[PDB]
Amino acid sequence: GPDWVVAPISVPENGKGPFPQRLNQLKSNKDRDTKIFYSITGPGADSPPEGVFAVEKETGWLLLNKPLDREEIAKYELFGHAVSENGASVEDPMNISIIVTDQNDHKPKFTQDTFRGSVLEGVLPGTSVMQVTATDEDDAIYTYNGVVAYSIHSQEPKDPHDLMFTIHRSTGTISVISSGLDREKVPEYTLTIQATDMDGDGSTTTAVAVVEILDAN
Ligand SMILES: [Ca+2]
Ligand SMILES: [Ca+2]
Ligand SMILES: [Ca+2]
Ligand code: NA
Ligand code: NA
Ligand code: NA
Ligand code: NA
């Protein structure tokens, strides 16, 4: 490409290296008759987090010094500088954008350890009981890394039967699917709920929802 220009640079988080890793070689056309010293400034270089990026003074290689974490900082905006050996700036500072792209490195996290809800004993099958939620810090815009699917792992007790409830795989709303709820017989159920990223193909996190059965009064 042309000298003293750089399009956005993408770097997946959690790279293996080796570090320091070359990202791009800065070059000023003024090097044709002059020795140039390159430098970088900006958050990530000379201000917090300091020293994540560096530039080789004479070669102009922009380096990444460690693996990045998209959930800490998703984008860096740095400036490249070119100064002659005599000490004169020979270019206007150049904007360097570093875009940290995602990896699926977070499991879903339920918003509560115990969700508590209730439902009347005589409701029609299909009646909504309550809603549970799990977030996922990963990207859900370009991939399914941050897209959660819900499921019910188990119900306690299994009375009158095994599965009295279901859950909406994307909204987390729990509904009644069977008849037979009766506060006098079984006043409470404990549902083991799961949230799985990659829209159900990834890693799973478990929590519980406790459902109180209310008297028809
Ligand atoms: Ca991360
Ligand atoms: Ca995830
Ligand atoms: Ca991530
Ligand atoms: Na890695
Ligand atoms: Na309810
Ligand atoms: Na997300
Ligand atoms: Na009933």
Side-chain angles (χ1 to χ4, degrees):
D3 309 333
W4 212 247
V5 67
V6 67
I9 298 165
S10 57
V11 182
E13 62 173 337
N14 304 341
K16 75 177 183 189
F19 300 99
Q21 178 186 159
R22 286 176 173 184
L23 301 182
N24 181 257
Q25 192 176 12
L26 311 183
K27 186 190 182 286
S28 168
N29 58 38
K30 313 285 184 78
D31 72 349
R32 200 183 64 90
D33 310 272
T34 317
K35 174 154 157 184
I36 304 298
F37 291 123
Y38 299 94
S39 47
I40 59 163
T41 60
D46 74 336
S47 70
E50 301 172 342
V52 174
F53 298 94
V55 66
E56 294 182 353
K57 196 194 58 255
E58 300 177 65
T59 67
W61 276 109
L62 173 63
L63 307 173
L64 169 61
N65 293 329
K66 64 172 204 171
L68 296 171
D69 172 5
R70 193 192 67 81
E71 291 80 34
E72 180 188 343
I73 294 165
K75 183 181 198 200
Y76 298 83
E77 288 297 333
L78 311 175
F79 285 90
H81 304 262
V83 179
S84 71
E85 52 180 338
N86 277 343
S89 175
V90 295
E91 294 294 352
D92 290 334
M94 167 164 66
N95 295 273
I96 300 166
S97 295
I98 308 290
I99 302 299
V100 186
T101 64
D102 197 49
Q103 298 285 200
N104 190 24
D105 63 344
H106 288 78
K107 299 189 169 168
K109 183 178 178 181
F110 276 100
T111 63
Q112 301 180 206
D113 298 302
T114 308
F115 294 85
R116 297 189 180 268
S118 58
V119 63
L120 284 155
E121 61 189 9
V123 298
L124 287 161
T127 302
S128 299
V129 173
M130 60 193 287
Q131 186 180 63
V132 307
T133 302
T135 53
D136 187 311
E137 298 194 24
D138 303 307
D139 164 63
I141 291 170
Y142 299 109
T143 71
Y144 292 102
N145 293 356
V147 175
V148 170
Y150 297 98
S151 56
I152 296 177
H153 175 274
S154 59
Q155 174 194 295
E156 282 293 327
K158 299 175 208 309
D159 295 286
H161 44 269
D162 205 2
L163 29 128
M164 303 296 292
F165 305 93
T166 194
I167 191 163
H168 187 297
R169 72 176 310 280
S170 296
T171 70
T173 294
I174 293 171
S175 300
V176 174
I177 58 160
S178 288
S179 65
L181 292 174
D182 184 321
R183 179 181 176 84
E184 199 177 34
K185 281 175 170 62
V186 176
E188 194 184 86
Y189 294 87
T190 298
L191 307 178
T192 297
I193 52 170
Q194 300 163 304
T196 302
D197 70 4
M198 299 305 290
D199 193 24
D201 295 338
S203 296
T204 301
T205 295
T206 303
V208 295
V210 178
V211 181
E212 182 186 3
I213 307 306
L214 305 169
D215 237 279
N217 288 315

